[PDB]
Amino acid sequence: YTRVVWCAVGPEEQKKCQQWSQQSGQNVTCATASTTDDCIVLVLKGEADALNLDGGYIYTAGKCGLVPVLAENRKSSKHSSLDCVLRPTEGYLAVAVVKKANEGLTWNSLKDKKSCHTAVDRTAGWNIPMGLIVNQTGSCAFDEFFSQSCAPGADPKSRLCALCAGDDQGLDKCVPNSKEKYYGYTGAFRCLAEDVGDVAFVKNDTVWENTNGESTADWAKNLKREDFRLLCLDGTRKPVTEAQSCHLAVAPNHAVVSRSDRAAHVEQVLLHQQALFGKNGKNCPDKFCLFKSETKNLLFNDNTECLAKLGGRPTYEEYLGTEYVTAIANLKKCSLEACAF
Template sequence: MRCRSAAMWIFLALRTALGSVEVRWCTASEPEQQKCEDMSQAFREAGLQPALLCVQGTSADHCVQLIAAHEADAITLDGGAIYEAGKEHGLKPVVGEVYDQEVGTSYYAVAVVKRSSNVTINTLRGVKSCHTGINRTVGWNVPVGYLVDSGRLSVMGCDVLKAVSEYFGGSCVPGAGETRYSESLCRLCRGDTSGEGVCDKSPLERYYDYSGAFRCLAEGAGDVAFVKHSTVLENTDGRTLPSWGHMLMSRDFELLCRDGSRASVTEWQHCHLARVPAHAVVVRADTDAGLIFRLLNEGQRLFSHEGSSFQMFSSEAYGQKNLLFKDSTLELVPIATQTYEAWLGPEYLHAMKGLLCDPNRLPPYLRWCVLSTPEIQKCGDMAVAFSRQRLKPEIQCVSAESPQHCMEQIQAGHIDAVTLNGEDIHTAGKTYGLIPAAGELYAADDRSNSYFVVAVVKRDSAYAFTVDELRGKRSCHPGFGSPAGWDVPVGALIHWGYIRPRNCDVLTAVGQFFNASCVPVNNPKKYPSSLCALCVGDEQGRNKCTGNSQERYYGDSGAFRCLVEGAGDVAFVKHTTIFDNTNGHNPEPWAAHLRSQDYELLCPNGARAEAHQFAACNLAQIPSHAVMVRPDTNIFTVYGLLDKAQVSQPRGHRGARALRAAWGKLCDCHFGMSLQQPSPHPLHHSFFLFNCIILTNI
């Protein structure tokens, strides 16, 4: 009896560890179950171990639940399902699919337009859109998530379908026919040749799947198609095609790039919405990944070539596509870093975050911090106006004694949001860990409520250099932690790859990048000496490098003086600094004789510009105000509320403010400001980003 009991325990232990007993594969449909059973038989006849069993679920989501409950062991999932399986159930990806040698274990989601059109990624509002299907990775999740994450599409109350239906000027989203917004989301769909199956998420709808969405664009029904990188090339230039595509040429189509430009359809590696991870086999965290791969690897060695008795990577015999594995799979490979974050990658994760919003978890109220009687009155009026427009969540107004008090209350979870100015924004991020949910964008001719961060140099043809040649130069900064003098320029140089901090040790990295600097700080004793090397202190030479006016090179004017007096080669300051200290505006002896035309700006694209061209040649435009929230707050919900509110308000007066989404994350080190890409056409909207700058307590 004891022997039998011991044997049973050994059996259960082996079964739990998948130790050469069985692997239970979960299937999501009858055809998939049939293919799984055929694969199981083929493996068994070939003597492959462990045994493969098939467990039928009702859907991929159901299979994930079965695996988490130890009632199944493995399933192949797409990116969206991998995200949910990893985040909610702790499953890990262990084996990835490879589709072609050029892209490996991934493919790319792209936005395609006709070459003759004028559409860009920044002008998608109101155009007609073609999608592969509702909740499909390339045709829905990535483009919609990207538009939300980048602030181009705002979503109120987690109602993504409504937001998309109002954003585009009509769409074909197969599978959206049962939603409340089918009139808009199915407007471009046609069904089959007899008009049946309109908007079905199946081949009955002619505009379904990759080729169908491209056909929607090619036939003129839509203006943009969201497909994968290979779709255009697979359906043009005389390849074996249905009649609708016989005359199509790939040169007549282009891709929309994230920076607002367009590119050839062959340039998808550099011009795409996101790199999409390949489908992957997922298992529980305690499952032996090596054992799973060895079984599948032996299987593909025997059953992936022409003429084999069973075809692992073909579903044709079952009248379906992509059963168990995608039919386009060339091989299966082991995954080295077995976490869903590593497998999905940052581009895809950002897109997914734009879609993650559970309406059941939304708070009924957004508690807004106010600081004065006029603010209380205005907040109350705003709450009433939002309520009348049925905007969600509703606003509650909570008073506080100071901006710092607001920050403390938000950090503690007693309040949700506050509008802060530039300096307080910096404090909120650096000291209290708050993040920006929305910034203010002003009319193009109204710069009274924002400023530009610029890199100023002397006009000297004998010693001219560009932003690409800053290494080894001497730099002047208003002070450590200053948005214009430190956060933006240092963040820009990091973002562009000129400065590469190790372990986020930005101080050392900056000190090594510049030959010498003056970066005044409160406690220079704990500071790299090179960052104080150019500082001069007061008239008696005391208080050198201190973060106050006793250091003559402190502040924007001080940093400019550092440049003027020849201590430094470049000064990072606000755009107004040159004009405040030249042409007779500053009577101090060091500035009285200065002329603005003797100074130039370094542009992100490698050019130089006149001082008055700061709007086109700057490192960032900083709006005066931003809405700050806790990191656990759904920033898309906050922005969605405010964006819908501003749309419903009267517009058109001079200087009207517009709220703009303001997020992103480049490094977890600390809070900083947004950067413009080094581009011939800098972005003209203002927004904030997190950047890898510094959290060091000096």
Template sequence: MRLAVCSVLCAGALGLCLDVPEKTVRWCTISSHEANKCYSFRDNMNNVLSVEGPHVTCVERTSYLECIKAIVANKADAVTIDGGLVFEAGLAPYNLKPVVAEFYGSKDDPQTHHYVVAVVKKGSDFQLNQLQGKKSCHTGLGWSPGWNIPIGILLPSDLVEKAAAKFFADSCVPCADQTAFPKLCQLCAGKGTDKCACNSHEPYFGYSGAFKCLQDSVGDVSFVRHMTVFGGLKENLFQIHFIQKGEADAMSLDGGFIYTAGKCGLVPVLAENYLSQDGKEQLGSKCVNTPVEGYYVVAVVKKSDADLTWDSLRGKKSCHTAVGTSAGWNIPMGFIYNQTGSCKFDEFFSQSCAPGSDPASSLCALCNGSGTPAHTCAPNSHEGYYGSSGALRCLVEKGDVAFVKYPTVLRNTDGKNPEAWAKDLKQEDFQLLCLDGTRKPVTEAQSCHLAIAPSHAVVSRKDKADFVRRMLFNQQELFGRNGFEYMMFQLFKSSSKDLLFSDDTECLTNLQDRTTYQKYLGPEYLHAIANMRQCLHSELLDACTFHGN
């Protein structure tokens, strides 16, 4: 089965839109996330193009149909929509035209199509011709992969909505009329008027939403495009896969993911050298050639929980940077595994936030997803408790212990972080748990830490390593902490936390002779990873290990 092209619609050809006197394209968005990206796109266009334009402005609507109507009414100019809606928008009374197609596939094999697939969980005991009476998850009413194609094949009827409501036990079909067809919205997760909504206010809307409906075991089958399934890979593993395939060249990774990247044939290129614990530069011009020393992994608790020690963590609520990371997972859970001999970490702690875990498990019970259910427990910045600062926030708001890199507490207390959750925090409100059962102030990590973890490092393919190294050194000279263009852009500063690189990076430094993942990570860390290997399931790591990298 093939999916129609996902296209951009405009009131005329895009060239005609750009020929209007104001040279402005009004882009239509259907959610706050889309709008924010559009505003960022607009601002960056203004920065790089001359005042003559062309320019982009952003128009907010609540659904793709509303965007189509806005274009017809000359209140917007363009929107990106699914192929099924391209067909509808081309009919009267809209009469709009597709002008640009999204390319998929790879650079060597570009494609303007993708495949429609019916996805089920492994172990399901039914076939495609046995879907009647099952619970179904759909991207949206009128979408090619989620509705038009599968329903057209299963139910060749003019009254498809009525027929689908009878064919499936229950469904989530965002954009459907839940008054007329309540069964088509029965499985949707939106609250109140957002239930079955035609935008991201409905958690099961769109490709990732329909797949999440299946992941959450709400539905038995999900109709999506084939690439959606690969989007289910943990984010860093997905990016490693892209670098391995040659569709990307480099990224900065935590030590745990450097291990996976190394098994997949990638090599470390440069390492992050960190600022001093008070947030000041300590190496200056010597930074790029100073060997990296790694960072302390610490267990942080509230000073007010005076009876909590390393030996009394069972049954407590835990906060982790993400599954697979050194500070938040591999090292602390490695110690716990050595104590218990069990990988059932969800039974050791009562509740946790460990981004990257199964959203339905207790390991995600504390996560907040930035208020959006679809992002809950995601191993990226969409999850508010992701990363070291996120894990500390989790501790402040919900948890008993946070496993983070040092000096996370120092960077987020005493006014150093103006965000609402952190602005009133005091350094003395927290303490470190030591492995010997004692507790110490957060400034004494040197004598009270779980381990020293390798610094984050940039990885690439061997054939690109030299080029990536030269490029990053060049960009560091421009946008590093002492760069010539530092005021224009800060390489090691993020609007959120730790985007692209860790925010406490002083510079990217040479690796000396540590240019393989084994040499970079060192024997102690490799031993720790080996102990945890049976508790970590990674399809990418399994595949790369099988192929002998």
């Protein structure tokens, strides 16, 4: 069975996958789709095997019978004795980030401001912050809360796409893939950094990874951590060093998913692939590294140390947690089960 078809979202992930495919000697091959939802459909049809998904998409996929297989694990201070593959995941902090210079902007004065989101349906970029805002406003009109947004995946003619820029040539405005300039963790943070939006909904790590010389990308070169503040739910503003006390939620890590009938085979292949191309893999620095793509988080987040086994062989609901699962269900009432395709 020993060949896995990975699903790449957009042309840049396709290019990375092709390299991985070459280096793996066709042990992995590539299918490509324009959106994550389209990739999920390829997996269901059996035309692709697997892809790595943010928590919000794991919810979509899980309702259609796809299962979590292995999880992204990043570096941590705690649980250091265990190998990365066997270490429990910790989850990431969803934060709301503003410019320090934008004084007196707090959680409570976000209405009618300009927002930057990773993509519709994603954990930190959409589900957590819009879930909170629906609950707080008692209204399903989340599309009228911000004056203008970039929320890749919304209607390109709506105000939710008004701030998105598209590609080099201005094509593909608001597509939920990396062709969109302001897509993803990095894109949404860039939307703030360039003062297109007033607030970005990303995760803690994104801020650290794109400031104080960590990035070297032309837009991120001169970004200083101190020029940013986190918005806390209590109306306060804190330095980005204080994320542990000023986040919107903790999110389940991104995770590889597959059709249940393929899970065991995808898992075995991926474990061998990471021994070759993972963090201290045989072939990484030298030939190819799975978990690098110049800050662009292609296929996997660049800060991934390894893919970890799950343990408790969880269902998608157990993986996401009852906490997160009810948040999503409640928000989804604005836009009670089956598969959405």
